[PDB]
Amino acid sequence: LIVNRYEKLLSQRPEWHAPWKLSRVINGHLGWVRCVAIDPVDNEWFITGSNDTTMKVWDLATGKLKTTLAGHVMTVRDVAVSDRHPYLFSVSEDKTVKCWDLEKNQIIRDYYGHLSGVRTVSIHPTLDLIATAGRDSVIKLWDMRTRIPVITLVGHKGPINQVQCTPVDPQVVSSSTDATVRLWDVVAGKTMKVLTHHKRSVRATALHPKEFSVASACTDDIRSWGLAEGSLLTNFESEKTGIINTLSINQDDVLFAGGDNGVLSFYDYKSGHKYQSLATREMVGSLEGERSVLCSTFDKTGLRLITGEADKSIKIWKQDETATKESEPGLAWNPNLSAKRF
Amino acid sequence: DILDLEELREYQRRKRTEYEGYLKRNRLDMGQWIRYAQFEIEQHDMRRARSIFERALLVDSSFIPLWIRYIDAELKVKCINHARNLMNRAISTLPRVDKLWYKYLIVEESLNNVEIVRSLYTKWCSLEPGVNAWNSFVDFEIRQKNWNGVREIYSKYVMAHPQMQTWLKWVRFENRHGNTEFTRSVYSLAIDTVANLQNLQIWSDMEVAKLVNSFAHWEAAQQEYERSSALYQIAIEKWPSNQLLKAGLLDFEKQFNSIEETISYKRKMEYETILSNYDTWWLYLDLISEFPKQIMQTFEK
Amino acid sequence: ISYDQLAKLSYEKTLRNLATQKVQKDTKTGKITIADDDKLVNKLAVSLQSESKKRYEARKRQMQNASFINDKNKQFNEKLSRE
């Protein structure tokens, strides 16, 4: 049967996307920029959580340091502005999930409960309820108003490197180090379906905006998953690229993946076609292992990628508006077939 | 030392308390789990051993050795259905590991439930496993005296692994097989498939070259060299980039003209020579062999 | 050598150890009683014990072969020396 599928693949054509170039570089923090998150209501400013613990807010247009925020103690591993209500959630290895209010620039409510240094926060899009999960191997669910944990989605057998809150029945996509991913009947307190198509730490996951799917990463492979049924959608061509740290998808089906190699990958989300590799640069003084993109996100526009690299740099990427199907095409896509996943 | 019953009970308790305690700290030390399970086995209380294994499994499924140990423990007390059920469960959990499948297979083989081993093998092969699985299956199905249904799986073994090595292996099998008609038939099939998927959607030129060579030598053993010749012409016709192909053809010609052989082969040597840099020797060779326009053009170059 | 190969190669071996020398289903219960030869299962049990025993004694010999202080260190220096 393989030959049929392969033939079908060859028949189809992954569309051309404009490639990328390093538009802006910001040596802002004094640590790794492990978290980056961008305001989805206005597309004006984006904050980034350092290892220093001082999450700093950055205007896009200028690029300048809008303002620092330092309520945490340990590395702010993740943050998440809620477009729904003006609350910047954040989270550190100090186990706090502090909710800032940007109408005041202070912190408002802490969410105590988490046993171990929480790695990720995701706010629920259609509720006043937020999801968080860390080394505890538990994806908790906080009612914001009342600042209690409502429910605790036990299941995972190992730390839980990412999480994504969606509006549907599978309200949580929990991506763990346990070489799994879970979709949850949140109301039930049960994994509705559990995809496991990963050899290694599933340590970079992203919801697609207008598709209702979620890409996940392993050490190399980068599946993309359709979370209605709880079904696979598409294997990718990530066969030689590094350990994926972050995996932010664009609005226009332009799935990003960030390498521990340092190499910025770039995929057509629909197909899997690796339509640009880009070996990143480090700052003059750095060491060659340090060039590692540890964070990433796209704007509302989708025309600016922001990447929290370990060179203490917040690099930003434009799509080339001078590009065509002849002036910089993709990397001449070819499904390899060598006992492959495609 | 361990004389009476109640005393043995106490010993069992104490030992358990140790083992349990050590598990409590490092929930994961499968060495500690499996050791404890061995202890249970030794005690000849099977249920407790099973429980231990289950708990251990829960703690870490991915550790294959644990699974194997449990399996073999089950086998030990001739509790074969439990072993079988478990092994099925193992397969279900971790199908893409091979050793579990092989463990199952050997168990069934020793059992002499040959039908079941066929059935399971069908399943495993159906999951597009490693080539190894296919090969082992074939060996089983050859160790099984019959030579039908094997054919079908070979056909499917191409379906999962469209690799020329597969085809070649199949041909080798047919060589073992008595009826030569199918050998030629197989060759015809393979060639046809190659033709159909001509464009860049398979193996490199190498594999195809190898195939063509093999076919050519099979025919060489057989009567019809006319058809071989035709195939060669077809091959050069159907395929461009014919270094391998031409080489093979040249060899065949040499076997089975001389000027041609020296010519094309020598030219190839020049190409090879070029790749190395005896470039003078190459040019000279060309000059001698030629065509003379390409001799003087390439000479100039 | 991967655990892929070492499995199949060990599979091939124990097939040579074999080369030396019915299904009834109650679908309501789901109980698939494969009544098979009780002599062959016993022959598996004895063979499998013997295989494990052979391996068990193999370590015992290799343990009794011989810059350290205690049992573990001697081996730990042996773990360094092999490199």
């Binding site: 599928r5 079908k8 992954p14 198509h197 799917s213 598409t234 | 279900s92 199908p95 059935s119 | -």
Partner: peptide
């Protein structure tokens, strides 16, 4: 007999877009 590891099956491996892109989820 068609029950050995009935939980697993190959169609879970099959990417449901690699065949048909623009499978509008």
């Amino acid at each position: 007999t068609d029950q050995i590891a009935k939980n697993v099956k190959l169609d879970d491996f099959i990417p449901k877009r690699q065949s048909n892109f623009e499978l509008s989820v």
